[PDB]
Amino acid sequence: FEFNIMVVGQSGLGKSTMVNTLFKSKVWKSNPQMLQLHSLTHVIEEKGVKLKLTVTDTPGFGDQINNDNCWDPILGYINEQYEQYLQEEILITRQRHIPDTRVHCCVYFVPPTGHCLRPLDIEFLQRLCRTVNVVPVIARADSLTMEEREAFRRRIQQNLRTHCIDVYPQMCFDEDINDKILNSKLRDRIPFAVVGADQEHLVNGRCVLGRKTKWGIIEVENMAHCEFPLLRDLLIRSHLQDLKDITHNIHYENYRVIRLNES
Ligand SMILES: Nc1nc2c(ncn2[C@@H]2O[C@H](COP(=O)(O)OP(=O)(O)O)[C@@H](O)[C@H]2O)c(=O)[nH]1
Numbered sequence: 001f002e003f004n005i006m007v008v009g010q011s012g013l014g015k016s017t018m019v020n021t022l023f024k025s026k027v028w029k030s031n032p033q034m035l036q037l038h039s040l041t042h043v044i045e046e047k048g049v050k051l052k053l054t055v056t057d058t059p060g061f062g063d064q065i066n067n068d069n070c071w072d073p074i075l076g077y078i079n080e081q082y083e084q085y086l087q088e089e090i091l092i093t094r095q096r097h098i099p100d101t102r103v104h105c106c107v108y109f110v111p112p113t114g115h116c117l118r119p120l121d122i123e124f125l126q127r128l129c130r131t132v133n134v135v136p137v138i139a140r141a142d143s144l145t146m147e148e149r150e151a152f153r154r155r156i157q158q159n160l161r162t163h164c165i166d167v168y169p170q171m172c173f174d175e176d177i178n179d180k181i182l183n184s185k186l187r188d189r190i191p192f193a194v195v196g197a198d199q200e201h202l203v204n205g206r207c208v209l210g211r212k213t214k215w216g217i218i219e220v221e222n223m224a225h226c227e228f229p230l231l232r233d234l235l236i237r238s239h240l241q242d243l244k245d246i247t248h249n250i251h252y253e254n255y256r257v258i259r260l261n262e263s
């Protein structure tokens with residue numbers, strides 16, 4: 001019943017706002033200077049299904065002049081959870097339920113530059129997708145027009161293919177034809193053009209999360225405004241269990257194979 005998300009990206013990309021946008025979404029009838037990793041856990045529920053959701057907010061990388069090996073604090077934390085799960089699994093006397101602190105999905109925030117992936121993003125995504133499920137998003141997508149979001153999305157998809165970045169949902173995990181059709185529609189939308197908002201607003205008799213601009217409000221849970229519902233339903237509803245299966249059966253097993261061979 002445990003599910004762990006981690007937001008990863010440069011500072012000023014709306015990551016902390018996105019953590020609050022998830023934890024206060026209207027899908028649920030239940031309302032609820034950083035320099036280290038901070039995990040926020042809330043045992044949420046939707047329609048009679050209890051879920052212990054944990055979202056780990058990360059400090060900003062890429063803000064320094066020298067950002068070489070800035071991925072190691074994140075890659076080190078992910079491997080720590082694999083190592084702790086492995087040590088609990090190899091004990092002679094084990095716990096009846098091993099606590100699952102492994103990251104089941106990483107949400108990587110791409111700056112809305114409108115150009116393409118930067119060398120920093122490529123190096124981070126290449127090493128992240130090797131050990132964890134990664135779903136990239138176009139951060140603060142409202143800073144780009146609808147036509148610019150689509151063109152920027154396509155160029156990123158081209159960068160992911162040229163640099164061999166297998167992003168969730170990985171095409172090598174679609175067995176059923178129904179999965180091949182549903183996931184192909186998702187990969188066409190990744191990276192999601194997301195917009196975050198932790199502020200509520202009264203919009204004609206409805207309470208909604210949104211960003212207040214000059215000529216209206218950007219309802220973040222409205223598909224006609226942004227693609228946050230696509231990211232939200234993937235993580236919480238449609239692909240929650242599949243993310244946990246791939247984390248356990250693929251990523252953790254790969255870590256286990258390496259550790260037991262070098263031992
Ligand atoms: N245009 C736009 N601005 C946003 C969005 N989300 C957050 N912001 C703004 O970005 C600023 C910093 O956001 P924050 O969540 O702290 O970014 P973080 O450093 O990655 O955690 C805030 O002033 C927010 O108002 C968004 O979806 N669109």
Ligand SMILES: [Mg+2]
Pocket residue numbers: 015016017034057
């Ligand atoms: Mg933040």
